[PDB]
């Protein structure tokens, strides 16, 4: 973790609840992360989007 390597939350794009915390390098990966993850509310896999922490 640094200024370039930031922490972030992953928000389930269906129910908007933040289910995961992780990191990326915003110089190497400037665009928002989209990753399919299991959402424990929706009880299914969902695209989660990077949201600010």
């Amino acid at each position: 973790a640094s200024e370039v390597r930031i922490k972030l939350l992953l928000e389930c794009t269906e129910c908007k609840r933040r289910n995961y915390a992780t990191e990326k390098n915003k110089r190497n990966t400037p665009n928002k992360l989209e990753l399919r993850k299991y959402c424990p509310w929706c009880r299914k896999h969902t695209v989660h989007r990077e949201v600010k922490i």
């Binding site: 973790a1 922490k7 992780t22």
Partner: protein, 64 residues
């Protein structure tokens, strides 16, 4: 005069029915982003304090 209950202990801890002392695992107050789900999950549980330390805490809770 009569002993006073330690409120710091009382707000952190519980004496179970059999005389054990139970607390919350330390280490998930913050700095959690890079901690695995296994670390965060298992830190959500209570745990049984070691006997030498539980005996000390229990003397602090004379009226429980």
């Amino acid at each position: 005069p009569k002993m006073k209950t330690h409120k710091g202990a009382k707000k952190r801890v519980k004496i179970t029915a059999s005389g054990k002392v139970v607390a919350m695992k330390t280490g998930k107050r913050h700095l959690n982003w890079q901690k695995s789900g296994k670390e965060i999950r298992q830190k959500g549980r209570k745990f049984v304090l070691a006997k030498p330390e539980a005996e000390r805490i229990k003397l602090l809770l004379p009226y429980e």
